[PDB]
C-alpha cells in the first residue's frame, strides 16, 4: 500500500515499529509478522521470567542473544529476528513491547471492519436496533462494521455515535440547549 | 511455537549466565558516577534504606524509580 505507515512518530518505539512495518510491508508479508509480535505481547503479560528478562538491563548482549534463540528461532519472520538481533546491539530490547503494540495498532486501523458504539436514553429495542442498524448501513452503505450499545448517558431520546475518531451528535439534549440560548439571544 | 516456552526461557536463563541470586534483596550496579550509583533489581527496598555494596562501602536508597535505584554513596566512589 505504497510501504507507508498510517502515521510517522519520532518516538523510539515509533520509529522502529514504522520502520517495521515499511520493511515488513515492503517484501510480501505484514500478517505474518502481525502474529509474531502478537504472540509477544501476550507472552510479556502471561510469563512472568520473559518481562523480568526484557526489562532486566544488567544483562549482556550475548547473553539477551542466547536467551531470545532458546526461545525460538524460527517461526518468526526474518524481519523480527533481525529486529531483535538490532534491539539487542541497541540495547532497546526493553521497549521490545512498545513496539509491538504500537505495531498491531497501525495493523488494526488497516483493517477495515470497525467497531460503532451509540449511546441513548431510553433502552434499544431490538426492533429499534434494526432500524438503527438500516440507518447506519444506507450511511456508510460500503463497509461492514459491528455495533455496540451503551445506555447510561443524562440526555434523552438521542443518540450519539461514536465510530473509531467520528463522533455525530443526534441528542435533543443538544437541541434543548440551542434553543434556550439562541431564545435568550433574540435582542427583542 | 509454544506458549509454554517460560520454562525453556527459565531454564537457559539460570544456565547461561552465573548470577540472578535472589533479586528481591540483590541488585547489581548500573552506573556509578558523581556520587551517584544507578542500581538494578534492588526490589523491596526503603527510601532510606542503608545498603551495602561488595567492597564493604555503604549508600542510602534515595531514589526509587520505576527500572533502577538511585542510591547516594558515603564515601568515595
Redesign the interface.
Known sequence: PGDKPPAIEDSIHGKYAGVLFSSASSNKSLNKVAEDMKYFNQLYKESEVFKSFLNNVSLKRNQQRDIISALGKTNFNPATNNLLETLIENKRLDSLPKIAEKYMDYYRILNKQESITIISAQELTAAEKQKVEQGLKKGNANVQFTVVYQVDPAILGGLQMYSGNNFLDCSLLSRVNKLKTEIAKISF | ?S?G??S??????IK??T?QNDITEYG?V?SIGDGIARV??LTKVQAGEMVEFKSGIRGMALNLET??VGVVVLGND
Open positions: 511455537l506458549t516456552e517460560a525453556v526461557v527459565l531454564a537457559e536463563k547461561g549466565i548470577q547489581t548500573i538494578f533489581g527500572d533502577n
